[PDB]
Amino acid sequence: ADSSPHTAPGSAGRSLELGAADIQDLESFEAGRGALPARAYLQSDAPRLSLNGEWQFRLSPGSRVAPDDGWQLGEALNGFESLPVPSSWPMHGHGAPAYTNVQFPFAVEPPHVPEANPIGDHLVVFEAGPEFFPHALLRFDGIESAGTVWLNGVELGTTRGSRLAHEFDVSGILEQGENTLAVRVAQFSAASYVEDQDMWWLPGIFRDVTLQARPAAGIDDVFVHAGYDHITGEGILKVEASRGGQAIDAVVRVPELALELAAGTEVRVPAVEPWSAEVPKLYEAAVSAAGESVALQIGFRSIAIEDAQFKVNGRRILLRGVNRHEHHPRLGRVVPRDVVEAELRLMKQHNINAIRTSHYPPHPQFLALADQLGFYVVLECDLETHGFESAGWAQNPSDDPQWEDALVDRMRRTVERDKNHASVVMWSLGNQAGTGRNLAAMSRWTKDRDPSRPIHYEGDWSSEHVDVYSRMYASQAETALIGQGIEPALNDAALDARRRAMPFVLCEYVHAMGNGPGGMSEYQALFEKYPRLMGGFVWEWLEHGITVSTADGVDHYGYGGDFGEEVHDGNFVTDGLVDADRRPRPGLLDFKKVIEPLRIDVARDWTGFTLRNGQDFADTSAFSFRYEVEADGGALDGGTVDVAPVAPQSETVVELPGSVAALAAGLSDGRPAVLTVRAVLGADSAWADAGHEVAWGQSVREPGAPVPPAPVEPVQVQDSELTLGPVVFSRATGMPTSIGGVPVEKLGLTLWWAPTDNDLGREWGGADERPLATQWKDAGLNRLHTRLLGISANPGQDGGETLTVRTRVSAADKQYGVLVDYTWSTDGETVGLRTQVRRDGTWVNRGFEVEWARIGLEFVLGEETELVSWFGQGPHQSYPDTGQGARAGWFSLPLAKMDVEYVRPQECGARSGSRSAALQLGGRTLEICGDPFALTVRPYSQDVLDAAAHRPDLKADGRTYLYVDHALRGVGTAACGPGVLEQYRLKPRDADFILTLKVRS
Amino acid sequence: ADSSPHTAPGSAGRSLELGAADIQDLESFEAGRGALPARAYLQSDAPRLSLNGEWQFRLSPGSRVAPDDGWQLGEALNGFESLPVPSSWPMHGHGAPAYTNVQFPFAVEPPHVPEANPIGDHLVVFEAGPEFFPHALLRFDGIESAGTVWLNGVELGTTRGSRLAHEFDVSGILEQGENTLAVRVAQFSAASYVEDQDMWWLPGIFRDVTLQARPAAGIDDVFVHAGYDHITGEGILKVEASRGGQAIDAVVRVPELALELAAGTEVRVPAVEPWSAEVPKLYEAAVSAAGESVALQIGFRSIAIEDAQFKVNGRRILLRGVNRHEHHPRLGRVVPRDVVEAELRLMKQHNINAIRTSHYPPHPQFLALADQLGFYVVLECDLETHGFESAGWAQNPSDDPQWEDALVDRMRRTVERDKNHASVVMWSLGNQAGTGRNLAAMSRWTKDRDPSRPIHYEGDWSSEHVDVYSRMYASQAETALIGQGIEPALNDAALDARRRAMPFVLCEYVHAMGNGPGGMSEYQALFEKYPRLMGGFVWEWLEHGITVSTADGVDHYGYGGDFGEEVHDGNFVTDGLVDADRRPRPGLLDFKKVIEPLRIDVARDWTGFTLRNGQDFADTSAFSFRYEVEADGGALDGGTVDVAPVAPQSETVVELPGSVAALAAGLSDGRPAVLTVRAVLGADSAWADAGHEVAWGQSVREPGAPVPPAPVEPVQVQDSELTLGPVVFSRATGMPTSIGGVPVEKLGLTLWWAPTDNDLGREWGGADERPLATQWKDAGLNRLHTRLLGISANPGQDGGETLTVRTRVSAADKQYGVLVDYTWSTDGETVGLRTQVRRDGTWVNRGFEVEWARIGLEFVLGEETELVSWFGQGPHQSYPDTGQGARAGWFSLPLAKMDVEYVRPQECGARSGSRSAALQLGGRTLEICGDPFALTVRPYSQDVLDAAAHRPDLKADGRTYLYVDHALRGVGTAACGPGVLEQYRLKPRDADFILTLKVRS
Ligand code: NA
Ligand code: NA
Ligand code: NA
Ligand code: NA
Ligand code: NA
Ligand code: NA
Ligand code: NA
Ligand code: NA
Ligand code: NA
Ligand code: NA
Ligand code: NA
Ligand code: NA
Secondary structure (H helix, E strand, O other): OOOOOOOOOOOOOOEOOOOOOHHHHHHOOOOOOOOOOOOOOOOOOOOOEEEEEEEEEEEEOOOOOOOOOOHHHHOOOOOOOOEOHHHHHHHOOOOOOOOEEOOOEEEEOOOOOOOOOOOEEEEEEEEOOHHOOOEEEEEOOOOEEEEEEEOOOOEEEEEEEOOEEEEEOOOOOOEEEEEEEEEEEEOOOHHHHEEEOOOOEEOOOOEEEEEOOOOOOOOOOOEEEEEOOOOOOOEEEEEEEEEEEEEOEEEEEEEHEEEOOOOOOOOOEOOOEEEOOOOOOOOOEEEEEEEEEEEEEEEOOOEEEEOEEEEEEEOOOOOEEOOOOOOOOOOOOOOOOHHHHHHHHHHHHHHOOOEEEEOOOOOOOHHHHHHHHHHHEEEEEEEEHHHHHHOOOOOOOOOOOHHHHHHHHHHHHHHHHHHHOOOOEEEEEEOOOOOOHHOOOOOOOOHHHOOOOOEEEEOOOOOOOOOOEEEOOOHHHHHHHHHOOOOOOOOHHHHHHHOOOOOOEEEEEEEOOOOOOOOHHHHHHHHHOOOEEEEEEEOEEEEEOEEEEEOOOOOOEOOOOOOOOOOHHHHHOOOOOHHOOOOOHHHHHHHHHOOOOEEEEEEEOOEEEEEOOOOOOOOOOOOEEEEEEEOOOEEEEEEEEOOOOOOOOOEEEEEOHHHHHHHHHOOOOOEEEEEEEEEOOOOOOOOOOOOEEEEEEEEEEEEOOOOOOOOOOEEEEEEOEEEEEOOOEEEOOEEEEEEEOOOEEEEEEEEEOOOHHHHHHOOOOOOOOOOHHEEEHHHOOOOOOEEEEEEEEEEEOOOOEEEEEEEEEEEEEOEEEEEEEEEEOOOOEEEEEEEEEEEEEOOOOOOOOOOOOOOEEEEEOOOOOOEEEEEEEOOOOEEOOOOOEEEEEEEEEEEHOOOOOOOOOOOOEEEEEEEEEEEEEEEEEEEEEEEEEEEEOOOOOOHHHHHHHOOHHOOOOEEEEEEEEEEOOOOOOOOOOOOHHHHHHOOOOOOOOOOOOOOOO | OOOHHHHHHHOOOOOOOOOOHHHHHOOOOOOOEEEOOOOOOOOOOOOOEEEEEEEEOOOOOOOOOOOOOOOHHOOOOOEEEEEEEEEOOOOOOOOEEEEEEEOOEEEOOOOOOOOOEEEEEHHHHEEOHHHOOEEEEEEEEEEOOEEEEEEEEEEEEEOOOOOEEEEOOOOOOOOOOOEEEEEEOOOOOOHHHHHHOOOOOOEEEEOOEEEEEOOOOOOEEEEEEEEEOOOEEEEEEEEEEEOOOOOOEEEEEEHHHHHEEOOOOOEOOOOOOOOOOEEEOOOOEEEEEEEEEEEEEEOOEEEEOOOEEEEEEEOOOOOEEEEEOOEOOOEEOOOHHHHHHHHHHHHHHHHOOOEEOOOOOOOOOOOHHHHOOEEEEEEOOOEEOOOHHOOOOOOHHHOHHHHHHHHHHHHHHHHHHHHHOOOOOEEEEEOOOOOOOHHHHHHHHHHHOOOOOOEOOOOOOOOOOOOOOEEEEEOHHHHHHHHOOOOOOOOOOOHHHHOOOEEEEEEHHHHHOOOOOOOOOHHHHHHOOOOEEEEEOOOOEEOEEEEEEEOOOOEEEEEEOOOOOOOOOOOHOOOOOOOOOEEEEEEHHHHHHHHHOOOEEEOOOOEEEEEEEEEOOOOOOOEEEEEEEOOOEEEEEEEEEEOOOOOOOOOOEEEEOOOHHHHHHHHOOOOOOEEEEEEEEEEOOOOOOOOEEEEEEEEOOOOOOOOOOOOOOOOOEEEEEEEEEEEEEEEOOOEEEEEOOEEEEEEEEOOOOOOOOOOOOOOOOOOOOOHHHHHHHHHHHOEEEEEEEEEEEEEEEOOOEEEEEEEEEEEEOOEEEEEEEEEEEOOOOEEEEEEEEEEEOOOOOOOOOOOOOOEEEEEEOOOOOEEEEEEEEOOOEEEOOOOOOOEEEEEEHHHHHHOOOOOOOOOOOOOOEEEEEEEEEEEEEEEEEEEEEEEEOOOOOOHHHHHHOOHOOOOOOOEEEEEEEEEEOOOOOOOOOOOOOHOOOOOOOEEEEEEEEEEEE
């Protein structure tokens, strides 16, 4: 209290504030107290009782008013109500979720906690039979953030490390019969300063609570060591077992390998089948002492770094990864097992082979599923101090000696829990925790304890205390330099030499927020080309949307700020490949294609395809290779082709049946036809059914360019309207008012789109750091207006005429514009529309050149569209730097399914590469043909889309908004990481393009 | 059409769009057509008929759909409805007002008009008797922006120059009996590009429409020349008269001067009383020909620039000015005469002596009122091209030869209308129109036509074509350099020499938006010290608020964007000294004091005062000098003192009656008493009643500093509360929960206030151009939180104790804080509160130091306050760099009258310099004493104030928000011009201060 300003004469007086002792504990730097030693999560035959279920719960707003009313004895519970456990309690109407990204939601003065600090008191009465005596423990697999535990009124201890397990000995405290377990949980504690992950703040007892008997002569911990010698094919096996901190005699049995060996001895198993994400071979094993048996699944694999490559079982691997948080839209950090199983299958179904547990250990039962389904796992300790960065990392716990014991404890618990799982191929120290002596201490502890797994940590770019060089969101350009080993040197020659000898991983890349991510293919090409590049993990698997309801009961996802937060980061928590209910976003469909493990390159003459097996261990024997030829009328040919199995990293040429090329050779010129070759699962796997598609390639015979009609109809002039065949025009605006009877409310040029999440991010570098969306607003691109310059008819053919409508498009207060001429022609059935765009003045504003979203047309039609059909790419959306998963073909969707249900509505739903489109408007069909154009159809305007913050803000107005774009820009990943690559940016230019239109009934 | 991209084979076709001819006319560079020569507005005995009244009106959205249906004959009017004329038609439910500041509301491509261009068709039937034959004309004193006029179906011509007069000969077209006048008015035209004033866009026939007979042998124009020779006292008189463009014989009679002379001859009048704003002497005159007589008011004055000074009648003058727009909150640009008369009286009542007609000629009848009441007028031509600045002035009309005739026409009409008025002392070419050849042409035309008045134009800083050096919002520092003649040189030595020989005027300064303007006194000191400084004109006289009603019928003022504008500038149109209904803002009350024309410096020993007459021409004989001594109980002494008249620019010492000093000498030490000496009007003037206050000065005997109580009561400790005499504290928060029975909901430190309009402006210069409001938001200053560190009692006196509550104030995600200790003491009746503030960490955020709004306390009391009384300054608000008009005294106001009704609610209502305050809360009174503190009391929180965009957003919640500030920052003028001067900025510091509190009943 010396820094506090007042100085009082006399000796110090007594402290009168309430709650001083509770707050002193919450502000403790200690890693909790009273717990048993950290150990593995082990399946054992020891009796077990889950205490999950309906508990009693009372919430107080802070420690100083949290009652000390003997509630732990369970006799006075008038202020308590039912609450399920496990739970994140703000998901059940107690307080509210709060989202921050980097910023802490409390003043940064470690270790101190704010006065507003929700305290949740939990209580359950349970029965314990004789099998839990004399010895038993209570296990808590997660408490956010600070728990104090009592049993029958006796304090057992405290928990720190919110996603880490704690166990408490209850021998001599547990009683036969009824027992009362009480747990006081503080939302905030000193630990909050090291738990600043970009996710919802959610207090609770959010994982299992278990009573476990500890029979005499049992097994407390087990450490499986299961290596693979790829030269000899041998497994290298040693299973350590301990009780009470001492090595014990136990018997290890592995029936499938005909093994019975002693614990603690290393043996060579003459032939094992090694474990990989591709082939996750597991051997069932048991480790047995007199009083207890532990069941294990052993996968034999060895991890090595050599020649600047990350190798498993002697081979460089490619990580096709995602960052997986634990989130459920209605349960918070509680993820039901069926949801976990389904989402891991969904990952495999989209070609993912690797998971980073961003940024804390997962539920303990996740590891066995990863072992079984096959993922390379980066298992990350629960540590993130990101919010200290804004003060230059002043007071960062990672470098503060007072935090050493707490941070080493986090790493020890992380490592000990999950050390037996073959899927764990790297330990990660944490995320965005800066640099410091405590991270070094965590690394040293881990390397000493478990030298079998390399250490990962992105926060220290010098990589002094790690085994791989990790970065997040490094540009494609920088990744290419690193891939070639030619990045700039570190200042320290010794550190530079070490880091240049390290393989390189992107622990986060291609930020998948909203419409995006763009630029994935450019990273993937590098990963495949350069051995030092290990691959990357997309940020992130899921959107953390939280289900809410409007006043009328319309369900939608909420994000930061939807829960009254004073400080929050908005929709940055909805930044995934799937929504919170695990529905794919288009980015997942594109990603699947980008990382597909086979490359199928179909010959232009349709005689065959080149096949490259991009897997590391498996051949192609799991796949059936299918071909199909489709034309406008439907499939013309199809079947299967036998492919002799191609070894990993090998390539072959496969001949297709002669009927396919004969078909190609017979096609009329200009008739469209698509040959697709697909690799599907030949048989059910653990993660998908036979017929599931893994890879594909195509060859397309493109339709001929559209033929404008002969301009043989003349312009008929009336007082207020002009008629040209099936088109009627306003003489006041020059715009069509109907085409073939389809009412047209507006036709005009487009240059802008409703900003994506990426367009709301700053594009660092250069002198202009305004987000693109702000550049557009400042430039008036969202508020264009059109002036009519003139309308005239010109001589056509055989008495016909064309009609040229001259316009200029600009914005209020701007001098730059584009002259736009529309030239219309018709033979009475088809309409030709030529659009010519010429800049009039430099598109520069506030000293920076204005980029465009598009060069296109918006037709506003005075009727609703029922069905949208097109030839192009699909079925899902595609933009210049996305759409890898959109394949060539003929597609048809009801209008509602053209949209994409991003949580914050934004530009989406364009189908790039379209050659023809057909919109069904009641009883008429409007057909559009062009050289490649992008197609979008919506039931609301761009201004409605831009203004909407949530999906219920969208409303259909009875019209159809049809967008036909001659040019589009890419979407990039500027919300976090690279913006649109140069080749996909759209700079102002002069342009012309032709469309043909037809209305049939 | 060559720039338009499409190229069509064959010869060009016929134009098919509608409205081409109307739009061609609107896009014309010509100054209108068909009008009679520009001339003076003259009062004549020729028969006159006002056609103002109920007309018929039809609105179309643009020229292309404006009907050409013979409506001008008045036979088919089914689409017409009644509309008063004169009117701004969007004030009557036709379309909507639209506010832009600089930005044009249409694409900038001169001379072209947008498609959305409201067309208002006006029609009236009137009767003309025989007195209007054979010759008559129709006069239009204002049409915004483009009128086409028909009478009985015959086109008379067109109008351009929205605030300029046009007359059309109707001889041979007017018929005896009924006539039909039709006027098509376009909102936008090529003229809009030269009418970009910062004000509402309001189309209409917004000034008088008059039929005037033109008898034979009449007088068409008159040019009065009336100079004054200050050496001899002579007037120099020549009155020119013309008819049909030729000089005529006419007789000039000036009865009061015993004159009968011929028009066109210069005479010397041996003794005249000269005209000035202080003494606006006017002589009634008549100029008569056989068929017509013109009545004139002649003021004799000569204007000269010599020795870098602007002189009238041989003396340097001081301009105490405002910029006057024409605006009415319900009628738009129509200002009723009674409103004009009242507002000019109000100006005189606040010591104003000068008006700039920003930025167009006023109603023609304004000039005679200015002549009569006495203002120096800067009469400004209707020209402003400000919106071209954002493109580097590309295409600026001022430098485009095609606009020469139009711009010279504007200046000619401006000069000719008002050239006879003594009040006009400068012609201004326009405002914010850049630089160019057409401005030079306007200046040359004016100097040739009327060399009697200097030319003003701020837009060309080289001053090549003007006679005074004018700037807007130059800093006090730059003004001081200019005042001393030591500003940097222009590159051209010849231009630099000319400009250094010019007097200097601020045509706009001390931008008066919202809470402000600060910094007025620093300008005024310079104006008074340096002869080259002519003075300045405040921006601006009035707020252009427009009266609107909420859903429930609550009237309030609207501003930009409240009328659906796509592009607008928000509340920048509400930036005046008075609201739209001419109610003073506090800035006017302060300004009155700043520019007061006498300086009264009261002696500290109360024996007398020094008096300086700061007028230029008048002595002090119009004033009665009053004194009063006031004490807590009321007035102790008062009366009048005879002052021998003090000449302009002279000073004297005036002895006060001995009773006043005897009173001062007898006062007990520490007893407060105030001596005020006032100069009031001794007799009714034309602009105020006898007793009206013009100037004042004070001497104050300050109350002694507060004496903290002896700390003889001890702290009583209860389970959840502490009691210390009359104060009860929470043991959970350390805050008082009641003081003497007054409920206290919260007590805490304040550092922030709800941003003023100035705080929302950028502070140019330095690397940080964020507005202060944004700096505060980024720093979290608007979201402070308090942590309780401890509560302890310490030994007091004779068994009593003090209570120290230690806290820390910070914001989420920030490391900087302030330690705040509160030390409480009491003797059972009075409470002492010592607050000590110490910074803990540097208040720096995003690399820039964080400034504070205040260092103070917020008491939130759980009851409503009825009445607020204080000793300090008042009655109105005062901040460190404002409050000049707040005088020392005792004040008492109901709570509602403490607030200030700014249109956008914002920080306001602080009373700086307070020594004691008393709040009546039901049956209790809370009394506060301190060394100088600022006092604010509100019925809603700062967050409610900040969130409110209009006054109906404010809501009382049943509490009292009491602010006691030990330190406050100034408010400056950063919305446009200088921010807070260094001496009034509030940087983070350590501070301590003492208050005493008492509750009586
Ligand atoms: Na322990
Ligand atoms: Na690689
Ligand atoms: Na995120
Ligand atoms: Na086969
Ligand atoms: Na594609
Ligand atoms: Na939106
Ligand atoms: Na004329
Ligand atoms: Na002066
Ligand atoms: Na303004
Ligand atoms: Na007198
Ligand atoms: Na004052
Ligand atoms: Na406000």
